[PDB]
Symmetry: D3
């Protein structure tokens, strides 16, 4: 391998400069197979990598794992191999009662509730997406019949205390994060996830483009975690949107 974690060489990317970077190693193939000539490349730790072809052009699909530190490794190593563009697709808990299960969210920037973003810039630096790649995510939603939510996402180093979940062993949340969900709700913050702050801050500072789209799997104003009673029932998927965003950008 040319890179220390991902198990990839530059040859294997066949000149790809754009990656779709989902969180889950298990989504990668499905993503890859919505494009042409999907090929397995590597699987090491949380990092499963496919190649596919969007309208004749090469696209790397590589999982990040949960949260910024695993993300930072993927993003650096892909960029060592010549990726300059990172499209995150993921699931997300809505914190606004008007943001329904199954809606799609385009994250334009992030509340920095991570530590990895600080390894790229002081906290004063905005965790902001690429304008042009956000534009293409928004457009790919609208083509899909979907007006996405566009705004600010709380990006958290934890799924439990940092997203003010109490259904936990101690059911205690440290002072900094006690009340914090209402703080972000009051500020019009749409959702929680766990990687966008890091991906954005490292992309913006290192001169790479990033954006993030995500399907809503629960509303935190009604359930801490989704269960069978939560609406699954499909519609227009964040995975189809990110692929068509990828085509917009390479075309």
């Amino acid at each position: 391998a040319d890179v220390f974690h991902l198990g990839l060489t530059k040859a294997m990317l066949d000149g790809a400069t754009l990656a779709i970077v989902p969180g889950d190693p298990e989504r990668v193939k499905r993503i890859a197979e919505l494009m042409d000539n999907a090929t397995f490349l590597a699987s090491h730790r949380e990092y499963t990598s496919y190649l596919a072809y969007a309208d004749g052009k090469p696209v790397v699909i590589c999982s990040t794992g949960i949260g910024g530190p695993s993300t930072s490794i993927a993003v650096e190593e892909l960029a060592q191999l010549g990726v300059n563009t990172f499209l995150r697709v993921g699931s997300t808990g809505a914190i606004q009662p008007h943001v329904n299960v199954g809606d799609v969210i385009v994250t334009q920037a992030s509340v920095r509730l991570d530590g990895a973003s600080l390894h790229f810039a002081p906290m004063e630096f905005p965790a902001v997406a690429n304008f042009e790649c956000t534009t293409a995510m928004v457009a790919a939603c609208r083509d899909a019949g979907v007006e996405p939510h566009i705004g600010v996402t709380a990006s958290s180093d934890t799924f439990y205390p940092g997203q003010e979940r109490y259904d936990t062993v101690t059911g205690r949340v440290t002072r900094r994060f006690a009340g914090s969900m209402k703080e972000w709700q009051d500020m019009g913050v749409l959702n929680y996830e766990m990687e966008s702050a890091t991906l954005f801050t490292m992309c913006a500072t290192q001169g790479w483009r990033a954006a993030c789209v995500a399907g809503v799997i629960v509303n935190r104003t009604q359930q801490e975690i989704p269960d069978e009673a939560t609406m699954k029932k499909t519609e227009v998927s964040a995975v189809s949107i990110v692929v068509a965003a990828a085509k917009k950008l390479l075309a």
Copy 2:
């Protein structure tokens, strides 16, 4: 007046929900007169307001003065009168050597080198512009034959040390800002101005839309202060028309 600083009532706005907010009280009238039926409203302290119409739609033009505290009172008090959109226009120092003087910058989000931003959100919250108004600025540039620089601006509570200016009485920059320019340069930050961090944080947190377009009057890789020698103000009026359509 129905507000504590600006000398305005809501009636005076004729139903305007959108403000063009430049810095100089001496630039309000001129911007306004790019519109129709430019109307004096009020001049108090650094707050000169005009009402004008943009293809039939009422627009406040209100100066903010320099720096986020003065901006925060203009933006709060205007909102208390129905404004829900704040389009910032002005001038800037470019800190990238590919941003030429007379370039246009559209500011997506800002480094928070201010204090007023912290009176609305903790520093972890991004100082981010409204996507729709930003999209409207970008389009107005392209209608005028201008491809703007789109990215990150350093928004500083000072003109001198915070923007890493040495041509001062003491010629010292406190540690925290010593080498700060380069840091921002290396980060791909385009420019310095003194309000967008406040404007963007307070609007984002308070459910109002904001955006920022600015013309480049010095390049900081060359010199600290501009030589003593229209497009941005043309674009912001263009954008205001798009958003009120």
Copy 3:
């Protein structure tokens, strides 16, 4: 001009080394007419400059605008022109029940609720007024038959949430300023204003003198000329 914002030359000030720095442009002229030979200098953005003469010596009267950013520009640009002394006057409310409308506050030092002070020193540095100019401000109060409240002022980057005002569109105050009025009240903080922290920190660190007198015109918990009258006597005290 010699300076980027204020539109002044070093010549225009006739060797003046002391400024009277109020916030409001529309107050400059009439502060300057309390002295001899009051002359319009420049008017740019929120910066309206006047010269006049205290017992034969020139004093510059220059407005700052609201808040430490616009203050920071005025103070730096005046200093580029040989000003070494910055007397702030103004009006304020108070957050203590014993501070009645009509009272004067001399601010000895300030809570740093601003950003621009951090552009001159880390937060550990005290936002402290010059002992000499503060003493002059006090003696002028007392000369006028006023015993001023001498204490700590909360200097806020904002009029509204930083001063824990809920009379706003959203009626929301961010967590760090939720409760913050009772905290300052309890620590004996006399009032809020929006400039003294930047002015203080910037003059201390750059080696200039500053002070801040202010008449009380409102008390949240429950004279304009006096405070201008007092600052002008302070200036003569210092230039005598």
Copy 4:
């Protein structure tokens, strides 16, 4: 499942109250297979879980993925299922010139260069390991003819800038992390890894025991990254952590 990520139920753990929590899902089965009756429990995302028996005592083996956020999920979710004790085994880079490739380190506490530890306690709280499980870690080294290094570990959210690696696309480290290796050096900080700060802080605060043993793969005084020239043949930190697990469950 009764936890949201791991795919586990309590019964699946057979009363296990102790996990070995490596980073790598690829390695969970091998670690398991150093115990008895290795049993596949779940695989979801970076989270591969096995049960096995440590001299008749049930042990869960669960991968954390890299860094504190993924670790935090695993530890919360195991602890809903009755785990009260978390032994971290893994690899590390040495930042002291006397700490040789192949030595073992038992981390008694960590520099909190992470964000997830702040989701459990303010920065003033120490990221300290449990005294008992650290002692067991040291006893299981010495049982194996190994004197481990025992001290403070720099626990970093990033592999690259936060460990002051410059062999990167930009070759730039942000001002906070610039010179930071020298700083931890001078402080007698022994090594870099990416999870112990989160784990220690979430465990000490939530009332759960934790410790962490790790084998040195590179010395940062000589190479950013281990390569073929780096030393290949010694007591494994996996052998140590299984040994400690028996002692603690004895």
Copy 5:
């Protein structure tokens, strides 16, 4: 004892509302003997307490120990027995070339390089002396024909690294304090000592007056002064109790 550390009772103070609070226990008795009818009160840990009379008014002389935390106990427990004014006297070195050995410093406010200050107010709060006590101090200097340096003091939790000293075992200064002296020197900071930040903030926040004079016995950049400083502070006490 009404108070757990100092071993004192309100009755023992005879209505004293003012304390001279020097750092060194061994100095207390002597400070006290500039005054009338000097009377041992208590000695526990680093806290030696005396009562003397300054122009017939009760004055407490109580040692604090070195640094903010020991200072914070003496100040709180004294205040519990009705003390409302605290005059600190000391010697100091000085970090400005224009400050000569034998000069006097009157600290008007202090850089907060302490932790105890933060146990009373966030860092934004200024570590400012009381204006009236400072004035008293300035005027007692002047009455002794001494023109004091009136400025900002760097109040450090440590004698060595927080004062950017390299003459230590390791010779190492942690990044925060690397270059820190030059920074304060540049900002006009006159000196380092180890308590004024704690004393100032706790007194400002709690509603008690404080002030600080100190003779300059050394200057990094380069008895009589100690007798001067303790003489000055006693003079200042009388000014305030008049």
Copy 6:
């Protein structure tokens, strides 16, 4: 002297490389007399030093005064005189209700409510005790038939507000320390004292060994002020194990 505060020369220590550092200058002679041939060295400010012999090896017994600034001077100046090991002994107030007044606490590490720590390392650095000296204090408890509480201590710059005491002149604690005792409680913090964060950070960083044992004189679940020894005999016993 060879040092700036303590009044000690290297010669006076007789090759002692280990100090016992209690807080109270009045506790020093007493500790020293638990060893052989106890010798007054000096007394300066809050710094009273004795020498004694522990199974034939020199041990310095040096008070630190209250709180990290004074501890930092005494620790630095001892180390200038060849001291590499500092065993701290003292009193403590327990915040967990399962800790009995009269119990022993062995502080593995400290919450840094103290400023002197920051003069040695950033707050991110853990205020961790030395493994071996902590190990030694645990074994010296158990040899004495006492199972000590082992974990985390809240090491505060103040006795009053930093320990969230309200029986004060103002009866007010600043926002950062309001509700803080409950927070430390919920996190399993054992006790409050005022030196261990400075001691541990400064030893850790400077390559010296440090540990702490202390006897519980008040339970803060009951009251704020203690009502009117094993930990001192445990510390002498830990010293002999480490010098053996």
